[PDB]
Design a protein around this nucleic acid. Structure first.
Lengths: 68, 68
DNA sequence: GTACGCTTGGTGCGTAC
DNA sequence: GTACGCACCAAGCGTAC
């Protein structure tokens, strides 16, 4: 039952010192959609929650995504 | 933009020799939603596509999801 | 398995500030 | 960055087979 708050989403990419645009691009995610999540206008879908928590635990995941 | 065909999704799972229910569980995904993807009813969302492709390239990603 | 109908709300903008 | 409106359709069923 994974979930993630708007503040947690922001704190992930601020740990990496990445802007919203940089982080969204490296996550193969629309920056406007990421804006929705960080502002709290909608709940991210289940796989987006999994992906965010994966990247947080294993930041090299961003490199694996770039290798797809 | 990453794409994945319904047959591609099934073969990822059949690599692990897992039923639709088992694979959806380890991927923190509704088994009925996965049914939509494998039948071609719907296009998986962008983060779902990324997750599936990570798993296809790195099977250990499945175990990493369980650590979450 | 397969397939189709349904409600809900996320997606991904456009726009203004 | 903030916040709101909008169309489109994915999500996650319930059901029939």
């Amino acid at each position: 039952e994974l979930n993630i708050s708007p503040d947690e989403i922001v704190s992930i990419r601020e740990q990496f010192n990445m802007s919203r645009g940089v982080f969204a691009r490296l996550l193969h995610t629309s920056s406007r959609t990421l804006e929705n999540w960080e502002q709290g206008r909608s709940v991210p879908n289940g796989q987006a929650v999994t992906l965010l928590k994966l990247v947080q635990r294993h930041p090299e995941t961003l490199s694996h995504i770039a290798e797809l």
